[PDB]
Structures are given as C-alpha cells and as structure tokens.
C-alpha cells in the first residue's frame, strides 16, 4: 500500500505494493507493512519500491516528503521520479564537472547552489 504521487504523474496511485526503500531526510530507510506514522522529508536518492518479490523499480527521486499515514499508507510525495536507465553516463559527467568549477568561485547564491548540486550528482553516479 503505497501512494507515491508526484506533481505531474502518479506512480503507485492505487494501494498495490509492499516494501518501499525510499531515501528520506535521515538515512536510507524502508517502509514495510504497517509502519509508524513518520511524516519526514525526502532527500535526493534512490526510491526503490520492492513490489512483493524482486520487482523493485529504481526511481531516482530528487527529493520531497515521504508522508506515512496511520492506516498503513505511505504517500511518498516527491518532485521528480525518473528511472535509472533514463540518465546517460556521458551527460552525467558533464554536469558534475561544471558544478565543481563554479563552486567557491563567486558570491551571492552562486556558491551555495553549486555545493548542493555536486552532492546529488555524486550519489546518483555511484548507484548506476
């Protein structure tokens, strides 16, 4: 029973799931059957929802809020949800190199935005 709905399309929609190893704000947690109501935020990681057997879909979520209701309902509301095969390895290396050179080189919000983008690009490249 998962309700992973994004702001453009619905993935889980209906309650037809079991396990959901989605990355929250703390660590790489995983929702089981009737988990506790933990409405914590989600970070940019890998939201692999194990459907019964080994039919897990590696959905590379960019962050959001994993709301857990008291009636065994996991509403993982994120911004984006793309698969692991939808990211080319050639274009992923160009974005990480441009963010590292722009970091600690200017002022205002240029150095702050480049530091957060380098951490999300390094975690997605190691899970390919």
């Amino acid at each position: 029973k998962v309700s992973l709905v994004a702001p453009h399309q619905a993935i889980f929609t209906n309650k037809e799931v079991s396990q959901v190893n989605l990355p929250a704000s703390s660590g790489e947690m995983g929702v089981l059957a009737n988990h506790v109501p933990t409405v914590e935020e989600l970070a940019p990681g890998v939201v692999e929802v194990i459907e019964s057997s080994g039919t897990a879909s590696k959905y590379f979520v960019s962050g959001g809020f994993a709301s857990i209701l008291p009636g065994s309902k996991l509403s993982i509301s994120t911004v984006e949800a793309h698969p692991l095969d939808a990211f080319s390895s050639e274009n992923i290396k160009s974005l990480l190199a441009e963010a590292q050179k722009n970091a600690s080189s200017a002022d205002e919000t240029v150095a702050a935005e480049a530091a957060i983008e380098i951490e999300v690009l390094e975690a997605l490249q190691a899970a390919v």
Partner: protein
C-alpha cells in the same frame, strides 16, 4: 566459632548489591514499551508477549543472588 558467625551476616549484605541490575531491568523494558504503545499500534498483542517474557528473564538475576544470601 566467632569467625564463622561474623562471615554469615556479611554474606547476606554484600550479595544484596545486585538488586540494582534487577530493579532497573524491569523498568527499562516497561519504559520502552509504554512509549511505543502510544503510536503504532495497540498494547494487547505483539509488544504484550515481549514485555511479559522480557520481564521474567531480567528478574532471574535477583532470584539467584537472593538464594545465596539467605543460605549463608
């Protein structure tokens, strides 16, 4: 035998120091069960079997220490 009678009373006093582990052990299992029964889920099952079986195992240290103190 003055030396045998003096050691009998001291044997029941130093052996009673082990009640700190048995007294705090019954409260450690009750503190974690009371804070977990208020949310997800009830208290008549699941955690009810662990609290009854867990309290009997932690209280076994107090029964063994009290038997050697009363026999000396």
């Amino acid at each position: 035998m003055q030396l045998v009678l003096a050691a009998k009373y001291i044997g029941a006093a130093i052996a009673t120091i082990g009640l700190t582990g048995a007294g705090i052990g019954i409260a450690i299992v009750f503190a974690a069960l009371i804070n977990g029964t208020s949310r997800n889920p009830s208290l008549r099952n699941t955690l009810f079997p662990f609290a009854i079986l867990g309290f009997a195992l932690s209280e076994a240290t107090g029964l063994f220490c009290l038997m050697i103190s009363f026999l000396l």
